[PDB]
Structures are given as structure tokens and as C-alpha cells.
Amino acid sequence: QKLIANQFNSAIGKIQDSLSSTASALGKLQDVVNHNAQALNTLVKQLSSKFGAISSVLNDIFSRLDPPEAEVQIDRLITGRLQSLQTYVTQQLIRAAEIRASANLAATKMSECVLGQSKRVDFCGKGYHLMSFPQSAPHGVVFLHVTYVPAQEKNFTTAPAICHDGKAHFPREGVFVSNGTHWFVTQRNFYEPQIITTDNTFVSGNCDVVIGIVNNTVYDPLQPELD
Amino acid sequence: NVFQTRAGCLIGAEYVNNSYECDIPIGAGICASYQTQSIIAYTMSLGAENSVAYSNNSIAIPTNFTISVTTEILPVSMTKTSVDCTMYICGDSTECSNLLLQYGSFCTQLKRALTGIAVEQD
Amino acid sequence: KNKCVNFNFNGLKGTGVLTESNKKFLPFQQFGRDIADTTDAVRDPQTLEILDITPCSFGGVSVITPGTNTSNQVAVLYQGVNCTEV
């Protein structure tokens, strides 16, 4: 408990250092901001564009041309700006579909990571998921996914099952693992060697049907009791 | 210095047989980066090569572990923009505004779409 | 100044509200533009004073309705409009 709590505290503390030192850690939200700003800027820029007209300002068009002659120029400018605004609306719709997909993903991640625990691989961050925390952002959500990663692995020799009394035993959980001299049952993700007994193994069939089966003692706790 | 790539001809970079995790992608598996004093192009490195020790009787199990925290970022909303047809289209002038009526219900469609996007953000 | 008026400054026709400005034009610049070429500021041809060109107040109006089946009362929301004016 102490070591795990200290590790969690250290990681949470280093999150701020990583966020501040990184040049573009928040690049994804800044991308939406920049996309909106650029769309608006280009939409405004198109106003200065002449679209083939004698000028891009309506007052001069109405001044130095008769209404019958200026009507074509007005029609050209109006159709050009209508097309520009329709293009803006279409781009907004496409980006809104993308944002809706992202928001649905964010809601699903909230529900699964924060409101529960996710068995999905690489969904609530990379690694064996524990939990997550949401953090508010100007136009998004930042998830502080807490994950579990194995470390300090070591080699071992194993067999699928243990044969005893002419019958094969298989583990309820974990693997049959030995450093080379003694056989122990160990859980997969943290080396916890258990003594091999009937408590953590179940029998199935005779021993000749299993490839690579090995022999070792399987203590019965009732025998020492001798009730 | 001139080099040839499937994406085209590259001038000003020297090709180096070394493989690095690359910064600037050019194409066809060729990237470039600052050598340090020069610009170098090279084939991408997809990471280290690891012949994991497979065997019919060997296992590797973690004797320890680490609990780590990583930050994921996802946008959720965008700016709720509103547009006025008359002012943008022709700058709030009467002569132009009079003619704009002839084009029909475009603005109703555009404003409906923008309002739908705005409500979708909320 | 300080009210919406149609203005013509040695040309440069436009409409807006005029206010004194602190931006310092160079001795040869007649008028200024903001991002995307909005006629942000102008210099008075006669007094040589510097004046901003602020667009006249505008905004969308939205009507709050409790349902015609319920009542005919309504409230109007002037988006972007300060209550110091209309």
C-alpha cells in the first residue's frame, strides 16, 4: 500500500511537469481552435476577393455603374459570397461530425474508465487499466488514465500440468512455475509462488494424454490433520 | 547534394545508411532530420528488433510492476458560430439587400444547419 | 461623434460610430485597417485627429416562447447587445 501510494503520488506530480514542459501536449484541442479560427479568417478573406468583378466593394459598384450594368456585378459578388458561405457551412458540418464522433468516444471513455473499469485493451490508456480521472479543458476533456504495467520480469520453466498419483492436476489460476528446483503455482501478473496442493489444483484424466506433463508432490492439508 | 526517392528527387540532403526514428516524413519510407549541422535523409526505423526468447517450456513473469499515469486528450465541442447573411454578403447596404431577396431560402437552410451544430455542441 | 452616423472622410464611404483614438498614425498614413482589412481607424482631414470606425450595434434576436398552447407571453433575447442600449 505504501509503495503503490507513493508511486501514484509521484506519477500525478510528474503529470504537471510533463504537461508544462511538452511543447504540443494539448495539440488536439488547439487543432480545433485553429481550425475554427482559420475557417473564419478565410471566410472573411473571401470578402476582399473580387470574384471577377471590377471591384470587391459594393459601394463603388453602385457608384460608377448604372443599375442595369451593375446588376451583373452584384449578381457575381452575391453568388460568389453565397458559395463561400455554403462551403463554410459544409466544412462546419463535416468537422461537427468529427467532433460528434470524438465526443461520443469521450462519453464512452468517461462511462467505462471513470464510472467503471475497462477490460478493453488499450482503450483506457496503454496497460492494464485501473481507473481514470477527467479534467476540464476549453473545448475537450483530458483523461488521467491510471494503468498497471509489469516490470522486473524473470525467466522460468513451466509445464502445462502436474501429474500425481497417476492423475493430472491443473491450476485454478496462474501457471505452474519453477525456478529450477521447486514447483510453485503463481499468478500471472505478479510473482506469488504458492505451494502446490489440492486447494489450488483440480484433477482431469490420466497423465499420458498431456504433452509435457511433469511430476511433483501435491500436498493434501487433511493428511497432517489426521482427524 | 541530390538523392532520388520514389516520392521524387530530393536536393540538399545527404542519404545516410543509419536508421533513426524520424521527424520529417518525405515519403516511400524516406524521412529527414537535422544531423548535428546538416540535413540527412534515411530509411525509417520501426523500432528495435527483439527476438523474444520463445521456447516450448520457458515463461517470463513480472516480479515487480509500476502504476503509471498518462494523459489522453479528446475534443468534445467547437465554437458556436452565428452568421448574418445580409451583413456578410453585402455589408448591410440597402441597394444590395433589396436584390438579395431574389435568391430565396438559402439563408434559412444555412442558419438552420448552424443552429443544429450549435445545439449539437451543447 | 459617439453616435451612429453615415460618414465620408475625403472618400472612404461608410457607416459607424466615431470615437477618439489613441493609436498613433505615422505622418503619412491616412487611415488604418485591422486584420482582414476592416477600416478600423481614420484620420480627420481637417483637424488631423485620429478616430476609430466602430460598427453600429447589431445582433440576433431570439424569442422565448412557453408554447402557444400554454400562453402568448414571450421574452426576447438580444444576443451580444448590452442593456446600456436597445
Binding site: 508544462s20 481552435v33 | 448574418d84 447573411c85 | 444576443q79 451580444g80
Partner: peptide, 22 residues
């Protein structure tokens, strides 16, 4: 802090403010 930002174009405010999101 890390992320930062008429002619007929205006931006409406979101229904949920930053304080309520927090």
C-alpha cells in the same frame, strides 16, 4: 493556460460555463 485562442460573424456562449463543467 497551455491552450489559447464584426463582419456578420459572431460566437455564441456555450450553455455550460467553465465553472459548471468544473
Amino acid at each position: 493556460n497551455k491552450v489559447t485562442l464584426f463582419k456578420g460573424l459572431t460566437v455564441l456562449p456555450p450553455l455550460l460555463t467553465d465553472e459548471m463543467i468544473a
